[PDB]
Design an enzyme around this catalytic site. Structure first.
Site, PDB file in Angstrom:
ATOM      1  CG  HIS A  54      23.004  19.464  -7.349  1.00 44.18           C
ATOM      2  ND1 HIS A  54      21.840  19.216  -6.605  1.00 44.18           N
ATOM      3  CD2 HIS A  54      23.344  18.286  -7.866  1.00 44.18           C
ATOM      4  CE1 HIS A  54      21.497  17.951  -6.742  1.00 44.18           C
ATOM      5  NE2 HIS A  54      22.369  17.356  -7.533  1.00 44.18           N
ATOM      6  CG  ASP A  68      20.110  14.416  -6.678  1.00 49.20           C
ATOM      7  OD1 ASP A  68      19.606  15.501  -6.978  1.00 49.20           O
ATOM      8  OD2 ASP A  68      21.354  14.171  -6.827  1.00 49.20           O
ATOM      9  NE  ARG A  93       0.242  22.304   1.794  1.00 49.49           N
ATOM     10  CZ  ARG A  93       1.361  22.815   2.257  1.00 49.49           C
ATOM     11  NH1 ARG A  93       1.775  22.529   3.494  1.00 49.49           N
ATOM     12  NH2 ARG A  93       2.053  23.632   1.508  1.00 49.49           N
ATOM     13  CG  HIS A 139       6.159  23.019  -0.852  1.00 52.15           C
ATOM     14  ND1 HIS A 139       5.088  22.695   0.017  1.00 52.15           N
ATOM     15  CD2 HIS A 139       7.285  23.088  -0.096  1.00 52.15           C
ATOM     16  CE1 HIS A 139       5.611  22.597   1.225  1.00 52.15           C
ATOM     17  NE2 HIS A 139       6.916  22.810   1.178  1.00 52.15           N
ATOM     18  CG  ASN A 184       4.967  25.848   1.511  1.00 55.07           C
ATOM     19  OD1 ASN A 184       4.050  25.503   2.257  1.00 55.07           O
ATOM     20  ND2 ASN A 184       6.252  25.807   1.874  1.00 55.07           N
ATOM     21  CD  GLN A 185       6.385  27.378   5.658  1.00 57.63           C
ATOM     22  OE1 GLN A 185       6.008  26.490   6.449  1.00 57.63           O
ATOM     23  NE2 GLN A 185       7.623  27.820   5.667  1.00 57.63           N
ATOM     24  CB  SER A 188       9.680  30.552   3.363  1.00 60.12           C
ATOM     25  OG  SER A 188       8.962  30.182   4.533  1.00 60.12           O
ATOM     26  NE  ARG A 257       8.799  31.908  12.678  1.00 59.13           N
ATOM     27  CZ  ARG A 257       9.914  32.434  12.223  1.00 59.13           C
ATOM     28  NH1 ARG A 257      10.362  33.561  12.768  1.00 59.13           N
ATOM     29  NH2 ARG A 257      10.566  31.875  11.218  1.00 59.13           N
ATOM     30  CG  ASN A 326       2.335  25.583   6.595  1.00 66.69           C
ATOM     31  OD1 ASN A 326       1.261  25.105   6.287  1.00 66.69           O
ATOM     32  ND2 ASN A 326       3.410  25.548   5.802  1.00 66.69           N
ATOM     33  CE1 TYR A 328       6.445  22.191  11.147  1.00 69.72           C
ATOM     34  CE2 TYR A 328       5.913  24.099   9.854  1.00 69.72           C
ATOM     35  CZ  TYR A 328       6.090  22.738   9.976  1.00 69.72           C
ATOM     36  OH  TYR A 328       6.017  21.913   8.877  1.00 69.72           O
ATOM     37  CD  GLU A 407       4.312  22.690   5.868  1.00 73.08           C
ATOM     38  OE1 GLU A 407       5.333  22.860   6.597  1.00 73.08           O
ATOM     39  OE2 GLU A 407       4.356  22.900   4.597  1.00 73.08           O
ATOM     40  CD1 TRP A 455       7.292  18.372   8.136  1.00 65.83           C
ATOM     41  CD2 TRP A 455       5.958  18.799   6.410  1.00 65.83           C
ATOM     42  NE1 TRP A 455       8.030  18.295   7.017  1.00 65.83           N
ATOM     43  CE2 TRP A 455       7.218  18.563   5.912  1.00 65.83           C
ATOM     44  CE3 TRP A 455       4.932  19.084   5.521  1.00 65.83           C
ATOM     45  CZ2 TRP A 455       7.560  18.619   4.572  1.00 65.83           C
ATOM     46  CZ3 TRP A 455       5.227  19.155   4.160  1.00 65.83           C
ATOM     47  CH2 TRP A 455       6.536  18.946   3.720  1.00 65.83           C
ATOM     48  CD  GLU A 462      13.151  20.337   7.192  1.00 64.54           C
ATOM     49  OE1 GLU A 462      12.168  19.838   6.526  1.00 64.54           O
ATOM     50  OE2 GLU A 462      13.012  21.426   7.834  1.00 64.54           O
ATOM     51  CG  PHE A 463      13.222  22.673   1.925  1.00 65.28           C
ATOM     52  CD1 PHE A 463      13.668  22.623   0.618  1.00 65.28           C
ATOM     53  CD2 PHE A 463      11.841  22.461   2.156  1.00 65.28           C
ATOM     54  CE1 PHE A 463      12.826  22.391  -0.423  1.00 65.28           C
ATOM     55  CE2 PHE A 463      10.992  22.232   1.095  1.00 65.28           C
ATOM     56  CZ  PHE A 463      11.479  22.187  -0.194  1.00 65.28           C
TER      57      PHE A 463
HETATM   58 ZN    ZN Z   1      21.718  15.800  -7.213  1.00 64.22          ZN
END
Ligand code: ZN
Ligand SMILES: *[C@@H]1O[C@H](CO)[C@@H](O[C@@H]2O[C@H](CO)[C@@H](O)[C@H](O)[C@H]2NC(C)=O)[C@H](O)[C@H]1NC(C)=O
Ligand SMILES: *[C@@H]1O[C@H](CO)[C@@H](O[C@@H]2O[C@H](CO)[C@@H](O)[C@H](O)[C@H]2NC(C)=O)[C@H](O)[C@H]1NC(C)=O
Ligand code: NAG
Ligand code: NAG
Ligand code: NAG
Ligand code: NAG
Ligand code: NAG
Ligand code: NAG
Ligand code: NAG
Ligand code: NAG
Ligand code: NAG
Ligand code: NAG
Ligand code: NAG
Ligand code: NAG
Lengths: 499, 499
Positions: A54, A68, A93, A139, A184-185, A188, A257, A326, A328, A407, A455, A462-463
């Site tokens: 936001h 949201d 998960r 997370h 999580n991770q 990150s 990785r 995780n 990827y 993931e 995943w 998606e972040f």
């Molecule tokens: Zn919002």
């Protein structure tokens, strides 16, 4: 003898050749999600991903999308269960939103009973369909109040607030939940949240990104990483001392990785590749297995690297029953300078490596993973053998852990229309090629891997990307989010699971 | 002799008969806004209106709309200035988002310099165009962290955090800003935020609304109202002791209504009408003029009504240089029971009155104000004479204060298409009919009113209604928010101002 493909075309989508029966009978297959990405804000307090998306809408995604409403799994959790049942999945998960069960962050301020009820109903519904929950406590969605009171994981106050949150989760849900993930991770948030400010909370040095509200990219990643490890370890100690009667297991989640040398005959690139293993994986796995950071990090990072006291070292060392890994993709590593006196220095520079998907002779590591339309030289490519290499490395370097792959997946563009989006053969190829190598490493190297969660269950926020990419094995229409329709990948995965 | 119309049709839209020259030369004319409603979340932290609209989307509006992007006055503040310049307005009321300048709530946690710069540029731009700023410190948008740390205005900790915020505003902006409002509509947060849970933060008794996360509708409104008065008064003391060199003025904002008896020959309805004046206006104006709550409130509310210490009484009494009076409508009052032992008791029941827009003989008080499509017997109707009655009452009862009318306006439906929306003759009628009575009361009763700010500059997010209604004198296209186009009302108001 198992042979697995590394390059297109792949032929592992044929469930005659690769299916769940290729793995041990008890092996868990499912999918994964997280709370910010799926639930919506209805019924919960605000967290730093609400705050970040936001305050910094251009960092939420190119579409300025946010969590949201998303796929409205607050309302449609039963539809998520239905997807899992259709898959005949044995694991799922998901994460608990801290802000849903303790909107005011600190447990003494009260709990949200209706939030607790939401997760009770989900858990009960999963178990009724024979699905094993794997539940992530954290997370990334830290209650905003905690970030505003003390800057969240930047401050040691996080430890006790996280502990009290986790205790509530074990008390309320641990009679049914037997697999817990703490954070999580681990890599990150320190790096993206406090280094590059790509992720919430969005702190960095002023010359790294002038929009950051505060921060120091050279120091804060290390502080935050250290507090994550301590908070994780305090929760694992609480679990194993106070909730042993529940008969469950707990562990952290790592982003893994693999790393290969950009030039495999160049000692400098070989050295950078080994530094990357230490700085990327060892930053957390050193503490988790030995109670200390890697020596190369001690040496390079110097006074910016926090110390563990003897009590802390003992708390962190061995603080897992299993690892959620995780995975990827894999990168090539070459040397890069570490300008510690530059005002734009970041913690990520301390590894002294530059990462690419193309090696010195021009070889791209594997098929396309993610296209970057603003700069195509920044496209990401995948590498199926990397899951083999990672698992082998964890077994050999990190004391033969119990592992669940928590993931693994690939995006397709949100610009595709629904028919293109449902015809997600690139996702089948990615998932099957990794599953082939995962079976291969279990058989050849005897890595103790006991499950795999792709995943994602369905399309979600998606972040960093909003709704501009899709990761789901089931499709969601953003104009009417009720249904989750299995894509070709979900249909393939159903057949893989029950061939 | 001035004659003003109370019923349709109105003929005060003719600027030959009513215009700014009808008022004193120095009289200020403009429009108003608030930060949550116009800016968007970009560049700021999260507040309880973000939290509330996200946790309780069906309470944000029927469309589940919120202030995430709205009219994007963060990006388009110059376009707001342009509207004001087009109007030849001499005043503009806007609010500062606390979460934009102190995202972490408590000033010692740091300030957002870029947020400060945003308001500096707005203020400088207004002054360059000859527009006097009227700046609201607190238009409901409390940093979420404060609500989560201590439940915001429920706790006396709010006082010092509000004071430190206000001090920063005076320090940074008071060289240019000479009219400050402390808290918007004192009645509203206690009753709607902590009584009925229609508004952020959304607290109430469990049987009032089972979705509330916590609360007590019988007690919390009084606590919150008391803390508002103390926080307001501490800020006014800070202003007048430490910022007297700035040569400005400060005051609270009241929501005003008039009240008439539902049956003007029934003593019980007459008594309920006088109780409503005390409970609605006197709740705050008693403290502000005398340092005590009204005796009827003391008697009725009993132990649920907090006491002021002698020091607090002295701080609150006289804590204004002027009053910002908002006025929209008037109600008829009839007796109603006050069931203090009921689990669904609310503070609002303590007045012992039921409020309607139709009297006992079936007379609707005036023209339609707001249609309620789910229940038409709940439609709101307006009453232009009410602004006369309110101002006269404030002069007579409350010691001849200096007054600015800080909001007055009317909505049109968001279901109307753009041409219907721009043809907002109902808004001209509402605004002119009230301005006629405002001129009349100034001339006849000598009320010290020195300006009028219509609600709203432009279409915006309306608390509780999303984008389902429009209040602006200028139109905003929600598909492309850049422009603010003067409606027929804005064009009329331009002519009224410069006839
Ligand atoms: Zn919002
Ligand atoms: C870049 O990657 C390619 C592919 O892995 C490497 O090429 C392989 O090199 C090995 C050893 O010389 C040869 O046996 C293979 O036949 C090559 N594979 C193909 C597809 O060319 C290459 O050596 C890497 N370059 C560097 C500089 O590290
Ligand atoms: C309801 O409101 C109407 C309108 O204000 C009141 O009617 C007025 O009553 C006065 C005094 O009897 C008469 O002189 C007026 O001519 C009436 N106006 C019209 C428009 O009818 C009425 O008295 C109110 N009813 C009650 C019970 O209070
Ligand atoms: C039902 C089915 O097709 N099952 C196949 C099985 O026949 C095959 O031998 C195995 C190879 O791993 O993959 C599985
Ligand atoms: C993390 C931890 O070891 N343990 C706590 C202990 O402090 C507490 O006294 C007991 C009852 O609350 O539950 C347990
Ligand atoms: C509808 C469906 O596929 N059900 C299968 C069931 O037949 C199989 O026995 C079980 C374990 O493999 O997985 C599930
Ligand atoms: C330019 C213009 O029309 N001005 C009118 C003025 O002539 C009129 O006497 C007054 C009545 O209040 O309203 C104004
Ligand atoms: C509200 C108030 O009266 N006053 C404060 C005073 O306490 C403070 O010592 C001085 C410098 O900060 O500025 C002023
Ligand atoms: C373009 C326009 O209307 N400008 C008017 C100016 O003529 C008038 O002198 C001033 C004060 O009344 O208000 C402004
Ligand atoms: C995006 O937003 C930030 C404000 O948060 C601004 O600093 C930056 O310039 C904008 N980025 C682009 C590429 O426009
Ligand atoms: C600052 O870093 C950017 C990216 O890290 C780099 O391209 C630039 O050269 C750096 N500048 C200095 C002064 O080193
Ligand atoms: C939305 O999707 C659900 C599931 O397909 C459907 O039943 C419902 O009618 C759809 N709503 C609209 C408005 O089309
Ligand atoms: C709206 O939302 C709340 C959950 O916040 C729920 O309790 C209530 O039933 C819903 N209202 C309607 C009218 O559906
Ligand atoms: C509770 O209040 C609602 C509205 O305030 C009312 O209609 C209902 O009769 C009340 N019930 C009791 C038990 O008094
Ligand atoms: C949006 O509105 C602005 C102002 O009218 C206009 O200049 C811009 O082109 C419009 N954008 C689109 C995409 O139509």
């Amino acid at each position: 003898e198992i042979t697995c493909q590394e390059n297109l075309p792949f032929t592992c989508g044929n469930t005659d050749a690769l299916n769940s029966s290729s793995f041990s009978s008890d092996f868990i297959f499912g999918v994964a999600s997280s709370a910010y990405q799926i639930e919506g804000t209805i019924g919960r307090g605000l967290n730093i991903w609400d705050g970040f998306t936001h305050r910094y809408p251009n960092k939420s995604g190119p579409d300025h999308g946010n969590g949201d409403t998303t796929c409205d799994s607050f309302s449609y959790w039963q539809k998520d269960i239905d997807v899992l049942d259709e898959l005949n999945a044995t694991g799922y998960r998901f994460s608990i939103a801290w802000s849903r069960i303790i909107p005011r962050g600190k447990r003494s301020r009260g709990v949200n009973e209706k939030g607790i009820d939401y997760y009770h109903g989900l858990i009960s519904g999963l178990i009724k369909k024979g699905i094993t929950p794997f539940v992530t406590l954290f997370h990334w969605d830290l209650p905003q109040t905690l970030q505003d009171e003390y800057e969240g994981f930047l401050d040691p106050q996080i430890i006790d607030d996280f502990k009290d949150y986790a205790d509530l989760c074990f008390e309320e849900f641990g009679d049914s939940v037997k697999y817990w993930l703490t954070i999580n991770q681990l890599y990150s948030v320190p790096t993206r949240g406090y280094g590059s400010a790509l992720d919430a909370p969005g702190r960095c040095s002023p010359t790294v990104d002038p929009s950051c509200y505060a921060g120091n990219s050279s120091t804060e990643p290390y502080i935050v990483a250290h507090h994550q490890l301590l908070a994780h370890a305090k929760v694992v100690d609480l679990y194993r001392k106070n909730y042993t009667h529940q008969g469950g297991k707990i562990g952290p989640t790592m982003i893994t990785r693999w790393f290969l040398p950009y030039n495999d005959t160049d000692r400098h690139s070989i050295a950078a590749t080994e530094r990357m293993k230490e700085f990327f994986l060892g930053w957390f796995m050193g503490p988790l297995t030995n109670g200390t950071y890697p020596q190369i990090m001690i040496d390079t990072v110097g006074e910016r690297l926090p110390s563990f006291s003897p009590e802390e070292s003992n708390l962190v060392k061995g603080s897992y029953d299993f690892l959620g890994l995780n995975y990827y993709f894999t990168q090539y590593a070459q040397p890069s300078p570490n300008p510690v006196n530059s005002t734009n220095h970041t913690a990520m520079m301390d590894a002294g490596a530059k990462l690419t998907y193309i090696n010195a002779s021009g070889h791209y590591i594997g098929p396309l993973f993610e296209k970057d339309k603003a700069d195509s030289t920044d496209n990401i490519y995948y590498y199926p053998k990397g899951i083999y290499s990672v698992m082998d490395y964890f077994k050999n370097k990190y004391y033969n852990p119990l592992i669940y792959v928590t993931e693994n997946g690939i995006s397709t563009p949100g610009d595709e229309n629904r028919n293109q989006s449902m015809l997600d053969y690139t996702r089948i190829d990615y998932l099957c090629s990794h599953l082939c190598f995962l079976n291969k490493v279990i058989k050849e190297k005897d890595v103790n891997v006991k499950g795999y969660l792709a995943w994602a269950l369905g399309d979600n926020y998606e972040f960093n990307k909003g709704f501009t990419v899709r990761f789901g094995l089931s499709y969601i229409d953003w104009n009417n989010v009720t249904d989750r329709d299995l894509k070709k990948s979900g249909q393939w995965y159903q057949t893989f699971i029950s061939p």
